[PDB]
Design a protein around this ligand. Sequence first.
Ligand SMILES: O=C1CC(=O)NC(=O)N1
Length: 221
Amino acid sequence: PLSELVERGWAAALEPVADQVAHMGQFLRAEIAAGRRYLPAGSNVLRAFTFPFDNVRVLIVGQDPYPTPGHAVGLSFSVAPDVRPWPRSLANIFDEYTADLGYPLPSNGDLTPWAQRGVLLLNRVLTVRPSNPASHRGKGWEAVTECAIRALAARAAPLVAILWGRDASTLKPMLANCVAIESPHPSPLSASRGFFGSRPFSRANELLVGMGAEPIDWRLP
Ligand SMILES: O=C1CC(=O)NC(=O)N1
């Protein structure tokens, strides 16, 4: 069960939806039986919950996994290190990264280092049918990720939420102390209509330091 699939803190945090998680496994099996595919790979579906629950300091919320085969890797916005070119959303994220932090363009699109350092890259929906954007909305994931977000918000610990999935009036209630939400809520495809210059990374660190936490080393190889 959950203790097998996710890190100990997450298993405890996600206990209230352990049965919903089992049901999602049954759903994915029935998709394959029914002849439909799903992304990401089954081993990557719960990957965001394989980094320590207690060590999360930043939450980045997306909506659905990349629908293009070989893109989704179970961390919102991330791609495998050999994926080129980057998806539009990630290229936009990396434009803001270089603009906000003054670092050079990353070598590749792998956000694993952010996950290691306590950035939770969480999609609201953890699977998708290939080539069918947002095809697994309403299939049961929302309850699971809602439980994750409410658990995160309940900890003593500091948390900064970045909302890159334009569902702020659903998500902001789950999150509202020791939680700062970055507003407004432009998404990476908003581009020059609010996303560029939003300085999400520097502002996360100002807010963390202001709550007595260490900043994130955002630096990618
Ligand atoms: O919401 C989103 C958009 C995207 O491009 N990729 C993700 O993993 N999340």
